[PDB]
Every structure is written in C-alpha cells, then in structure tokens.
Amino acid sequence: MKHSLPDLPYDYGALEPHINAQIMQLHHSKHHAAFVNNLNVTEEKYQEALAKGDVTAQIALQPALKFNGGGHINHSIFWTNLSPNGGGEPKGELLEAIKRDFGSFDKFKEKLTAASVGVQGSGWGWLGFNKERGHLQIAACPNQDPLQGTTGLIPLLGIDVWEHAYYLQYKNVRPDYLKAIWNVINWENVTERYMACKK
Amino acid sequence: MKHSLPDLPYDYGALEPHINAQIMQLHHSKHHAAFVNNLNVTEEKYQEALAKGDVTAQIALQPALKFNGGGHINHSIFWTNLSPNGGGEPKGELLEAIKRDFGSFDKFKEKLTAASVGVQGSGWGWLGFNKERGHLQIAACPNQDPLQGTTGLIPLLGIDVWEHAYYLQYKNVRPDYLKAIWNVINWENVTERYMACKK
Ligand SMILES: [Mn+2]
Ligand SMILES: [Mn+2]
C-alpha cells in the first residue's frame, strides 16, 4: 500500500499571519515527509519479522512505528483542520454539542488551550468524540502517540504543540501561537469528522 | 511459522522442595498456554492490519503483542534456566566474567536479588550480556516486556518475580522465593547462552 505524503490543501502562506509560510513548508515538506519514509521502512521490517516469527524484532520496532506512524496520522489530520477561510465559531449540532459538554464555546477554548499549554515536552492536544459514551472528550498525547490508536477516541481537532510548529515565529511563547491558531480553524472539516462519528 | 508451547524439560515435581509441582503445572499449563495462543491471535491481526496499511490498528495491537510476545519469550527461557541438575556455582569463563564485572559470585547474587525485589508491580529480573560493551549487565523489566526487545541485551538468566510464580508457597515473602530459586538454576544452560554470545 505504502504511505504517501498528502498534498497540502492550500498554499504554504495561506495561514499568514497566524502561521507563517516558512513553518508550513518546513513542517510539511521535511518533518511530515520524514514520518512517512521511516514509517514505510519500519513497516517493511515488521513484515520480515512477522514472516520469521521474530517477536523480539517486532517489539523493538514498536517505538519507531508509533512515533513515525503517529506522526503521519496526526499531521494528515492537522492540515485539514486548518483553512485560510477558517476561524470564528462552528454552527449547528457541533456547536450545540460543544455547549452541552463544555458549557460554551469560550469555555471549550479555555479547556483545549489549557490542555495544549499543559503538554510538558513534545506531543499533541486533541478534541475527540467518545463513541461508546456518545459525547466529546479532550485528551493529550505525548510525542506522536495518536489519539484513536492509544485512547480509542475519534480525533476531531488536533493542535500541534511541537516547537517546530511555532518556534520560528513565536519562540518560547507557545500561548501566543495557541491564541493565533483559532483564527484559521476549518470548522467545516471538524464538523465532517463529528458527523462521521454519528449515524 | 507458528509459535508453539514448548514442553517442560523436566517433571513438574523435579524442583521440589524449592518450587512445588502445583506452581510448575499452573505457571506452565495455564499462564504460558494463554500467552502463546494469544500471541498467535495478535500476530494474525497485526498481519491483517499491516497488509491494509492500518497504522491505528497496528498501534492498538502493540500492548497485546508486547505483553503476550514477551510472555512467550520470557517463560520459554525461564524453564530452560532451571533444572534438577542445577544449583551451586558456575565454572569457567562465565564465573570469571561474573567476578570481573560484579566482584564475586556472591556480589552478583546480591545485585540480582536487589533488582528482583526492587521490581514494583509485575515484572522480571535479568542477567544479560551487552554485546556492544562486551560485558554482563543486570536489568529489570516491567510486566512481560522482554529484555532484548526493549534493551538490546541478550538474556542469560531470568527470574520471574510475578506473584503467580511463588505466592501459593511463599505468600507475600518474595525473598524466600528468591533464596530458594538459586538451588535450581541451570548454570549449564546459562553458560551455553553466554558462550553463544562470544565467538
Ligand atoms: Mn509536527
Ligand atoms: Mn510468569
């Protein structure tokens, strides 16, 4: 099957001034690319280990698969969660669910901002949908550990709090990056992911 | 290639009074049996997930693969690490290496006992060989995480401090179990594993 780097849905500068073109080009063409090439190499090594029944090799390969595999899963979602036409607030059933589960859109923003700022080290913040409980849920993931693979929650909106996503523009001030990114959230995509969870 | 439950190399009662027949039969015919079978189920799933390129499914299967795969790796070694012909002290180059790297055989016993008592929760203690440094090394692993797959060290002697290995006989007093097991260590097997590392 072989994983492939998806095209970005917009120009590298489409999210200016909130995320500059240099970050988008680096974050997409270098970081994400590395997560795909090394993921493909690791998957191929696993195929060899499985055919030989080498369980030691399978277990030794798990960290590279989760790190590079999670990186591929996460970034692919992140690009679609943003848009030059984004920002503002969602509408319809998604906004109703946000108000029901978090009180209000503003309170939801505070909680997701807090979870994203609260990641110590590298990782991600996610708004997800809990299919079994039938409601929204916020979770944090370290490094590149993907939400669904490690928690079962279906990802709706991810924020890449890695330093390579903002450090060139905002330096150490991650909160300024988190505030700015709300202006480019593609709520149309987040809604599609939400409606896909429900029948 | 399908993994198979190995026969025990001795009678269930061959290690009495140090480890009773009820433990050997349970620890082998129930616990290990579950690991091997569940490992095969997980491998078949992971093969299916790998062929589809489903990285989320692969990552969700990692805990079962490490737990059951490690269980198969560890226990298969553990049975060979014990023998009715065991006990006493090793000889030859392995004894020389123990004295060189740990000071004395008694000092090695103290270090491995300390590592085994020090496991908080379920896990194992291992004497291994570091191929890159060319010397022995003691390490502890949680749950069923295997030594080589998680550390690169080649396993020589493993001690199962899991509560299901001694609780029927020694209850909470793990040190009594650790004291007894030294009488049945198959140093011939440990020597073979050590000599297999050197060429
Ligand atoms: Mn990233
Ligand atoms: Mn056991």
Curated annotation (Swiss-Prot), chains A, B:
Record's cofactor remark: Binds 1 Mn(2+) ion per subunit.
Named cofactor requirement(s): Mn(2+)
PROSITE patterns: SOD_MN
Post-translational modification: Nitrated under oxidative stress. Nitration coupled with oxidation inhibits the catalytic activity.
Highest taxon above the source species: Eukaryota
Induction context: Expression is regulated by KRIT1.
N6-succinyllysine modification, residue list: K45, K52, K99, K107
Major localization listed first in the record, in broad terms: mitochondrion
Binding locations of Mn(2+): H27, H75, D160, H164
Disease / disorder: Microvascular complications of diabetes 6: Pathological conditions that develop in numerous tissues and organs as a consequence of diabetes mellitus. They include diabetic retinopathy, diabetic nephropathy leading to end-stage renal disease, and diabetic neuropathy. Diabetic retinopathy remains the major cause of new-onset blindness among diabetic adults. It is characterized by vascular permeability and increased tissue ischemia and angiogenesis.
Known function: Destroys superoxide anion radicals which are normally produced within the cells and which are toxic to biological systems.
Similarity comment text for this entry: Belongs to the iron/manganese superoxide dismutase family.
Subunit field text: Homotetramer.
Record-given protein name: Superoxide dismutase [Mn], mitochondrial
